[PDB]
Amino acid sequence: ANRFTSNIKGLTQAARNANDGISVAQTTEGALSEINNNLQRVRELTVQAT
Amino acid sequence: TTDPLKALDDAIASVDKFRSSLGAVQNRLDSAVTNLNNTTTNL
């Protein structure tokens, strides 16, 4: 039972940690989306300029 | 520190070993007390 107690605590903490990685992925995806919008606008302007 | 969690598990098992041995000794002592009470009554 001591071994289950340790296992349960570790697994719960690991899930809590994984949530942080999910948050990091979401934030970086938002930044990448902003960069993508800028790139598409630049592409359209290059089309208009050539 | 390298390999922390395995060392922590080793320490936890090492203290569990001592606790289990102590509990076994408690059971033995209780059995001894019971036998001594019976022997005293009979004598």
């Binding site: 570790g10 990685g21 990448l32 | 969690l5």
Partner: peptide, 27 residues
């Protein structure tokens, strides 16, 4: 236990690392 990791890769994204360094449409 130990070594229970999921690897996230992060790539440096900027003008230099995208080929758009010095991009001009004029002289």
């Amino acid at each position: 236990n130990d070594n229970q990791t999921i690897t996230i890769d992060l790539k440096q994204i900027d003008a230099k690392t995208l080929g758009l360094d010095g991009f001009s449409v004029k002289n």
